[PDB]
Each structure stands twice: as structure tokens, then as C-alpha cells.
RNA sequence: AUGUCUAGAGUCUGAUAGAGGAAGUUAGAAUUUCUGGUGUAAGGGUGGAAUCUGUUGAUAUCAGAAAGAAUACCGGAGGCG
């Protein structure tokens, strides 16, 4: 039984999966959840509905860590990232900032090759 | 074969644009690996799966260190050779 008050919620929303981590301001992780862990599999893992369920389950995991004050971090092009933020709002835990940490290189590390050569 | 001229072509003077070339320095983002924390059962991937990765602590997240390669935005019915 601890009280933190402040916190962060990281959300990675790629084309295959959604991962939601709830962590301190320092960044130390309190809990996490994922679409694969929420029982979905296959294309369901990347639908906006699965993102909504994953996020709200992640926060329900941490109902009793005495936090109501979060910074949202988003990366990835997934369709339902807005749904993740919307569900975080729907749970009633208030947000103070929304950010993106999507890595944009300065042209290094030549990427993968195209599909269907 | 020997002269003459300046409009062709050059030299000199002045102005000016440019990823032109070579050599020597420097930079940050991102990625990977390694080390140290938080934390748990998935991660990853496809039309759909599996191989693979992960309970020897993954993925995710925070901090530090190292190396390599390439230079987003400017940036195009551009510029130079």
C-alpha cells in the first residue's frame, strides 16, 4: 500500500500490438498490460477496441497506487492510440500532459528492405 | 609567303552565385550491444500462422558506457561539374 499521486503512462501502439505501462515520475514501472495478455490474438491485437481494453485494464491494475495525475507518452502509428488516451480519460484518472516519443532518426541505420521484392 | 584590323577567342581588373574536388577536425538524433534499477508472462510476426525471443527476468521503462554507419527539417516543375 503506497501513495505516489503523480505518474506516467507509456503507450506503444504499433501495427501488431499495444503495450501500456504505468510507471512513476522517475519512470520506475508500477505495472503493465498488453493486447496479447488481454486474450486477443491475430489481427484483433491492433484494433482500437483492443487498445481501449488494454489501457483500461492497465489502469485498473493500479487503482490503489494512490495516483490521479499522469503524463501520457505515445509512440507508434497504431490506429487506436487516440482510443488509448480516451479510455485513460474515461477511467476518471486525470491527465496533465500528452506527449509523443516516436523516434525520428536523422538518417542513420538503413532500414529493412521492401516486401514483395 | 609577308603584313594590317577586332567583331571571334583569350589575358588582366572589378563584381558575384554554387551539395565542384581533395585533405584535416567536430556534432546531434536514432539503432544495436553491455552494465545497473523498477516490473511480469508474454514478446515478435502475417492474408492467416509458425520458426524465433522470454521465468537463466524478455518485451516495456529509467540511468550510464561503447562502437559503427548514414546525415531528417532546409530540400524543389533548385544549384554546380
Swiss-Prot record:
GO-annotated biological processes: translation
Picking any one GO molecular function of the record gives: structural constituent of ribosome
The record's GO CC annotations read:
ribonucleoprotein complex; ribosome
**What superkingdom does the record give?**
Bacteria
Query: NCBIfam families recorded for this chain?
Result: PRK05309.1, uS11_bact
Q: What does this protein do?
A: Located on the platform of the 30S subunit, it bridges several disparate RNA helices of the 16S rRNA. Forms part of the Shine-Dalgarno cleft in the 70S ribosome.
This protein's name: Small ribosomal subunit protein uS11
Amino acid at each position: 500500500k503506497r501513495n505516489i499521486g503523480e505518474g506516467n503512462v507509456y503507450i506503444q501502439a504499433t501495427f501488431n500490438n499495444t503495450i501500456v505501462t504505468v510507471s512513476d515520475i522517475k519512470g520506475n514501472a508500477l505495472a503493465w498490460a498488453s493486447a496479447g495478455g488481454m486474450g486477443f490474438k491475430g489481427a484483433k491485437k491492433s484494433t482500437p477496441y483492443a487498445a481501449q481494453i488494454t489501457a483500461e485494464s492497465a489502469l485498473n491494475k493500479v487503482r490503489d497506487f494512490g495516483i490521479n495525475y499522469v503524463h501520457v507518452y505515445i509512440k507508434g502509428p497504431g490506429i487506436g492510440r487516440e482510443s488509448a488516451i480516451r479510455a485513460i480519460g474515461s477511467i476518471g484518472m486525470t491527465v496533465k500532459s500528452i506527449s509523443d516519443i516516436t523516434p525520428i532518426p536523422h538518417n542513420g541505420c538503413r532500414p529493412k528492405k521492401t516486401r514483395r521484392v
